[PDB]
Amino acid sequence: TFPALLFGLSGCLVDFGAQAATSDTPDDEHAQLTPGAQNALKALRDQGMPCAWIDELPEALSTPLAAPVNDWMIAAPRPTAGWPQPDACWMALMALNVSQLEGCVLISGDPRLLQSGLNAGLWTIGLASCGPLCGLSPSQWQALNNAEREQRRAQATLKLYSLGVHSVIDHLGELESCLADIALRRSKGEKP
Amino acid sequence: PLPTFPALLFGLSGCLVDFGAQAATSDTPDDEHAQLTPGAQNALKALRDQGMPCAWIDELPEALSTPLAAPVNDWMIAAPRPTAGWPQPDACWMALMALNVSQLEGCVLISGDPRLLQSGLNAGLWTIGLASCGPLCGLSPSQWQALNNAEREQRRAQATLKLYSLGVHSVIDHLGELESCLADIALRRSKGEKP
Ligand SMILES: [Mg+2]
Q: How far is it, in rounded angstroms, from Cα A126 to Cα A109?
């Protein structure tokens, strides 16, 4: 079983290309859910899956960004010790009252958040298209040719695996299958 | 060389001090309960000399655990009390945070209390159980010493089986065995074993 799923906010649930930090101003476009995020969240709410979002942006920037998910998921309490310390992830799991670490998963495209999850002892899922390793807005990503999007994904994928991340997928539309494969690995005895 | 340990967590009562968890028998603090458990001075010198980050964990009221921590408070951190108590992982995670631990990997909890050990297992830690001094034995030093050898062996064996049944990783008779116990866990880790 999965006691909880933790999600990055920007460059993960919303803000494709992690553009909200790129400015000190809020921007309406950035609160858009990333490809596959809406339906992944529908499924998680229907399942009753405990979930929380995690980010390091100032509340002024993260509040408008979280609006799309605030009906699905709490903001984890911010630690005094930030990423890559494990604290953020432990405090998220604690806010969700999880009974045990085993089976908890963090999903992000940000290496600093992913490292927090790795340090904390969670399973980790990296996102290949929408995080800061790619850093392109939706319109920018769409303007590339096929070969370019492939190159960008593959490059981010290897960077993420080099961190020690357990699985990398293109987008949150792949989350369900990704989690099912972690379940199979776990049944074979794999631990984070 | 073998993998190293970044931090060690210890129960206070029935583990570092208070053989037989006798602080649970009275609301007022008893100076006799602050006696360190057999082998503790030996284990703790090695750890303190090494600069091993260590914190203690308990659930007793402050009126009791503060006096109990007297023989270790020169150097060992008191873990902050969690809102959600054992067997929730919170007590152990909060202790690791208090030690500014950078990774869960290799962290160990030592206790004879099944509820605290369960917290450590839930928190994802390595666990070492104590067969003599914890609540499953629940006898004061005088009561423990009044038994015969056979009765002490029987009680250690019973506690040892219960702790392994919980899923604890290694069980030892007392803290004098901690160094060797840790060395064998490091060897297991070197062979790819995880908690
Ligand atoms: Mg591909």
A: 5
Minimum Cα–Cα distance from A80: chain B residue: B97
Strand A74-75: give its sheet, edge to edge.
Answer: A74-75, A51-54, A5-8, A105-108, A123-127, A167-169
Task: Identify the H or E element spanning A34.
Answer: none
Q: For the purposes of burial, counting CB atoms within 10 Å of the CB of A144, is it exposed (0-12), middle (13-18) or buried (19 or more)? A: middle
* Residue A123 sits at the chain B interface (C-beta within 8 Å): no
Q: Any idea how long chain A is?
A: 192
The C-alpha atoms of residue A168 and residue B63 are separated, in whole angstroms, by 51
* Ligand 1 geometric centre to CA of A1 (Å): 27
The answer to whether B140 faces chain A, any CB pair under 8 Å, is no
Dihedral sign, CA of A136, A137, A139, A142? positive
Distance of CA A123 to the CA centre of its chain: 12
Q: Measured between CB atoms, does B98 come within 8 Å of chain A?
A: no
Q: Which residue type does A17 have?
A: G
Long-range own/partner contacts, residues B69-76 (CB < 8 A, 24 or more apart): B69/B12, B69/B17, B70/B34, B71/B16, B71/B17, B71/B34, B71/B36, B72/B12, B72/B16, B72/B17, B72/B44, B75/B48, B76/B10
Resolution limit, Å: 1.9
CA-based Rg of chain A, rounded to a whole angstrom?
Answer: 15
Q: How far apart are CA A65 and CA B169, in angstroms?
A: 44
Closest to B5 (Cα-Cα) out of B99, B114, B115: B99
CA distances from B189 to B100, B183, B185 (A): 22, 10, 6
Contacts of A85 in chain B (CB under 8 A): 100, 102
- Residue B160: phi and psi, rounded to 5, are -60, -45
Ligand 1 center–CA A129 separation, angstroms? 10
Name the experimental technique: X-ray
Strands (DSSP E) contained in B26-70 are 54-57
Contacts of B124 in chain A (CB under 8 A): 100-102, 121
CATH code for the domain defined by B1-195: 3.40.50.1000
CATH number attached to the domain at A1-192:
3.40.50.1000
**Domain edges within chain A:** 1-192
Query: How far is ligand 1, taken at its centre, from the CA of residue A156, in Å?
Result: 11
